[PDB]
Scaffold this active site. Structure first.
Site, mmCIF file in Angstrom:
data_model
loop_
_atom_site.group_PDB
_atom_site.id
_atom_site.type_symbol
_atom_site.label_atom_id
_atom_site.label_comp_id
_atom_site.label_asym_id
_atom_site.label_seq_id
_atom_site.Cartn_x
_atom_site.Cartn_y
_atom_site.Cartn_z
ATOM 1 N N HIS B 64 12.470 -7.072 -4.751
ATOM 2 C CA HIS B 64 11.738 -5.812 -4.434
ATOM 3 C C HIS B 64 11.579 -5.686 -2.926
ATOM 4 O O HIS B 64 11.556 -4.562 -2.426
ATOM 5 C CB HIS B 64 10.382 -5.779 -5.160
ATOM 6 C CG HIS B 64 10.518 -5.886 -6.650
ATOM 7 N ND1 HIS B 64 11.130 -4.891 -7.413
ATOM 8 C CD2 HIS B 64 10.113 -6.851 -7.516
ATOM 9 C CE1 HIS B 64 11.092 -5.241 -8.693
ATOM 10 N NE2 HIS B 64 10.477 -6.459 -8.782
ATOM 11 N N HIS B 89 4.871 -8.497 3.387
ATOM 12 C CA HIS B 89 6.181 -8.004 2.901
ATOM 13 C C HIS B 89 6.476 -6.686 3.610
ATOM 14 O O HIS B 89 5.560 -6.178 4.284
ATOM 15 C CB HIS B 89 6.169 -7.866 1.391
ATOM 16 C CG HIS B 89 5.158 -6.854 0.967
ATOM 17 N ND1 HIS B 89 3.923 -7.202 0.527
ATOM 18 C CD2 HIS B 89 5.149 -5.510 1.036
ATOM 19 C CE1 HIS B 89 3.205 -6.117 0.263
ATOM 20 N NE2 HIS B 89 3.918 -5.080 0.571
ATOM 21 N N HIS B 91 8.667 -2.677 3.716
ATOM 22 C CA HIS B 91 9.306 -1.521 3.045
ATOM 23 C C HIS B 91 10.210 -0.852 4.076
ATOM 24 O O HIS B 91 9.752 -0.661 5.219
ATOM 25 C CB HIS B 91 8.257 -0.581 2.431
ATOM 26 C CG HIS B 91 7.308 -1.233 1.491
ATOM 27 N ND1 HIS B 91 7.550 -1.306 0.147
ATOM 28 C CD2 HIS B 91 6.091 -1.781 1.691
ATOM 29 C CE1 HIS B 91 6.533 -1.915 -0.444
ATOM 30 N NE2 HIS B 91 5.625 -2.220 0.484
ATOM 31 N N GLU B 102 6.101 3.769 3.778
ATOM 32 C CA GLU B 102 5.470 4.245 2.533
ATOM 33 C C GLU B 102 4.508 5.364 2.912
ATOM 34 O O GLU B 102 4.622 6.436 2.365
ATOM 35 C CB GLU B 102 4.815 3.037 1.866
ATOM 36 C CG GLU B 102 5.844 2.036 1.404
ATOM 37 C CD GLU B 102 5.464 1.413 0.090
ATOM 38 O OE1 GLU B 102 4.480 0.667 0.063
ATOM 39 O OE2 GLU B 102 6.062 1.779 -0.900
ATOM 40 N N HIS B 115 3.220 -4.707 5.229
ATOM 41 C CA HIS B 115 1.944 -4.859 4.494
ATOM 42 C C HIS B 115 1.521 -6.328 4.564
ATOM 43 O O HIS B 115 2.291 -7.175 4.140
ATOM 44 C CB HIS B 115 2.080 -4.364 3.053
ATOM 45 C CG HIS B 115 2.221 -2.880 2.947
ATOM 46 N ND1 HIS B 115 2.845 -2.280 1.881
ATOM 47 C CD2 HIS B 115 1.918 -1.890 3.825
ATOM 48 C CE1 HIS B 115 2.811 -0.958 2.053
ATOM 49 N NE2 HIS B 115 2.253 -0.696 3.249
ATOM 50 N N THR B 196 1.214 -0.013 -4.067
ATOM 51 C CA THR B 196 2.359 0.949 -4.045
ATOM 52 C C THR B 196 3.478 0.456 -4.969
ATOM 53 O O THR B 196 4.488 1.150 -5.108
ATOM 54 C CB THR B 196 2.807 1.187 -2.608
ATOM 55 O OG1 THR B 196 3.323 -0.041 -2.093
ATOM 56 C CG2 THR B 196 1.648 1.678 -1.758
HETATM 57 C C1 LIG Z 1 4.263 -9.073 -8.816
HETATM 58 C C2 LIG Z 1 4.130 -7.919 -7.838
HETATM 59 C C3 LIG Z 1 5.474 -7.244 -7.448
HETATM 60 C C4 LIG Z 1 5.675 -6.873 -5.919
HETATM 61 N N1 LIG Z 1 4.528 -6.313 -5.170
HETATM 62 C C5 LIG Z 1 3.761 -6.989 -4.302
HETATM 63 O O1 LIG Z 1 3.967 -8.162 -3.945
HETATM 64 C C6 LIG Z 1 2.505 -6.333 -3.798
HETATM 65 C C7 LIG Z 1 2.516 -5.150 -3.022
HETATM 66 C C8 LIG Z 1 1.353 -4.552 -2.509
HETATM 67 S S1 LIG Z 1 1.349 -3.177 -1.582
HETATM 68 N N2 LIG Z 1 2.868 -2.668 -1.498
HETATM 69 O O2 LIG Z 1 0.548 -2.178 -2.203
HETATM 70 O O3 LIG Z 1 0.981 -3.646 -0.312
HETATM 71 C C9 LIG Z 1 0.098 -5.263 -2.844
HETATM 72 CL CL1 LIG Z 1 -1.494 -4.645 -2.395
HETATM 73 C C10 LIG Z 1 0.063 -6.436 -3.617
HETATM 74 C C11 LIG Z 1 1.213 -7.026 -4.120
HETATM 75 S S2 LIG Z 1 1.217 -8.508 -4.994
HETATM 76 C C12 LIG Z 1 -0.390 -9.231 -5.015
HETATM 77 C C13 LIG Z 1 -1.152 -8.801 -6.248
HETATM 78 C C14 LIG Z 1 -0.556 -9.229 -7.587
HETATM 79 C C15 LIG Z 1 -0.073 -10.530 -7.829
HETATM 80 C C16 LIG Z 1 0.438 -10.861 -9.087
HETATM 81 C C17 LIG Z 1 0.484 -9.905 -10.112
HETATM 82 C C18 LIG Z 1 -0.029 -8.616 -9.884
HETATM 83 C C19 LIG Z 1 -0.549 -8.289 -8.625
HETATM 84 ZN ZN LIG Z 2 3.759 -3.120 0.254
#
Ligand SMILES: CCCCNC(=O)c1cc(S(N)(=O)=O)c(Cl)cc1SCCc1ccccc1
Ligand SMILES: [Zn+2]
Ligand SMILES: CCCCNC(=O)c1cc(S(N)(=O)=O)c(Cl)cc1SCCc1ccccc1
Ligand SMILES: [Zn+2]
Lengths: 260, 260
Positions: B64, B89, B91, B102, B115, B196
């Site tokens: 991703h 990470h 985008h 984003e 992020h 997101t």
């Molecule tokens: C398993 C999750 C898939 C990929 N997304 C992220 O790592 C991610 C992206 C964001 S963002 N783009 O809003 O900044 C945020 Cl805020 C958190 C996560 S992952 C951390 C939370 C999480 C961990 C495991 C399962 C579900 C949520």
């Molecule tokens: Zn993100």
């Protein structure tokens, strides 16, 4: 059933209407990086646009927009097949945010947008049959900017008060539908896309005119305040506002222009 | 299974991840009519962001994005709870259309967005457990534009070669993560939204720094071209590009600014 707000909104369309979660979705943001001049893109001709002012045409609140029914003698020449008119309708925002065009230009919404829907009459008998079929539909899109009073657009807007509620219908005198089009219709964007509404079929040859038209602040306020998505007798009435889809991923498409 | 393309794309996320069709979805367009100065928004303090160059941190391609694992000892001071770091990470878009942030400002996409994901470590043991709970997550968002070479971002991009494919992992000497932040971090946008990405939980306190950073045209190109979302021996490789969500509707709400 579907809306532009909350649970039944556009992020949920694909749960009931799979094409909404498929490829080649509209609308899109028109921006320099994805534009491509194409010498193929010759001027459209608008045949039978000049509707008798002594004839009558059905205006309908369909619960999603205000629609004007157009006769199939009205057509576009210039594409790969004859595209015959079926209806026109609008997309707009709300009094507190009058920026409800579907298509954006370098990330900017216009006040509103007109869609003149045509179906492939060489292949199909009506827009309904054509909607889920290859090469089924062609739309002319006019971007609408807040500016001077538009007497032509008012030949629709003066009638909204008779179609306030879903399923209400009112005869409107004919006028020359060409008066709704902008200057220099020879200048347009062309791309392969979809219905911007469910069922979102990727069957639409999009033509978005380069130039906008203007309607007044009072015309937009009337359009943004006159219509409900709901039946006259519905105990949870919803204002027909913000009836536009967010722009969609390009999916490797380019937008072809008649201009450089 | 979820992607940014094809049938498993963002319009379909709501089928397996209901919250993706719910309230408080990110990202959004940041524009004048929804900004309100709130004098009560003081500077964040970044604690334990100065990572030992003699310590190593896991960089991963999860198919991703590319993610750098961060130690929980690093955190944000200034909010009502302590939020501890979990990962950062990015985008981005694609080389033909290098506009893959984003969040948008006045409908404009930046080249990319970083992020730094934190979780409510006062209430929750981990980001996973925090993700679907009240006040669970806090993200620092940095907008990235084309510009001068950024030695600090190159501490990440110099290792993309080792995580080309889904699954690949690599180690990164520690650097000062505060070096990835723009000038005047006192200036930021603040709003309650969502992940997101699936599961799109409405659990994120967003802080989008007002000022972008710059990376060189060559750094941006590496990011856009270095990585695949498929396994090293997928027969049909897919380039990892356009890994950003379309902006969401943001109806009858404000983004607060730390700046007048
Ligand atoms: C398993 C999750 C898939 C990929 N997304 C992220 O790592 C991610 C992206 C964001 S963002 N783009 O809003 O900044 C945020 Cl805020 C958190 C996560 S992952 C951390 C939370 C999480 C961990 C495991 C399962 C579900 C949520
Ligand atoms: Zn993100
Ligand atoms: C069926 C009710 C949904 C409301 N949408 C339209 O009328 C409509 C909108 C567009 S758009 N916004 O892309 O310009 C287009 Cl291209 C066509 C139609 S309706 C005509 C096709 C159709 C008829 C009957 C059932 C289904 C589709
Ligand atoms: Zn339409």
């Amino acid at each position: 059933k579907w809306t532009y707000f909350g649970p039944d909104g556009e992020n949920s369309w694909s749960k009931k209407y799979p094409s909404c979660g498929g490829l080649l979705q509209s609308p899109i943001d028109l921006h320099s990086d994805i534009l491509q001049y194409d010498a193929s893109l010759t001027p459209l001709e608008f045949q039978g646009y000049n509707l008798s002012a002594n004839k009558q045409f059905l205006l309908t609140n369909n619960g999603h927009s205000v629609k004007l029914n157009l006769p199939s003698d009205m057509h576009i020449q210039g594409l790969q097949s004859r595209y015959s008119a079926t209806q026109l309708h609008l997309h707009w925002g709300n009094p507190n945010d009058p920026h409800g065009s579907e298509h954006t230009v370098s990330g900017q919404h216009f006040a509103a947008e007109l869609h003149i829907v045509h179906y492939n009459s060489d292949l199909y008998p009506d827009a309904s049959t054509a909607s889920n079929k290859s090469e089924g539909l062609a739309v002319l899109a006019v971007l609408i900017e807040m500016g001077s009073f538009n007497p032509s657009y008012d030949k629709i807007f003066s009638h909204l008060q008779h179609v306030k509620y879903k399923g209400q219908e009112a005869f409107v005198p004919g006028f020359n539908i060409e008066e709704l089009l902008p200057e220099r219709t020879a200048e347009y964007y062309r791309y392969r896309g979809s219905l911007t509404t469910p069922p979102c079929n990727p069957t639409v040859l999009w033509t978005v005119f380069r130039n906008p038209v203007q309607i007044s602040q009072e015309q937009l306020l009337a359009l943004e305040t006159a219509l409900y998505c709901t039946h006259m007798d519905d105990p949870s009435p919803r204002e027909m506002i913000n009836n536009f889809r967010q722009v969609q991923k390009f999916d490797e498409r380019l937008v072809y222009t008649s201009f450089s």
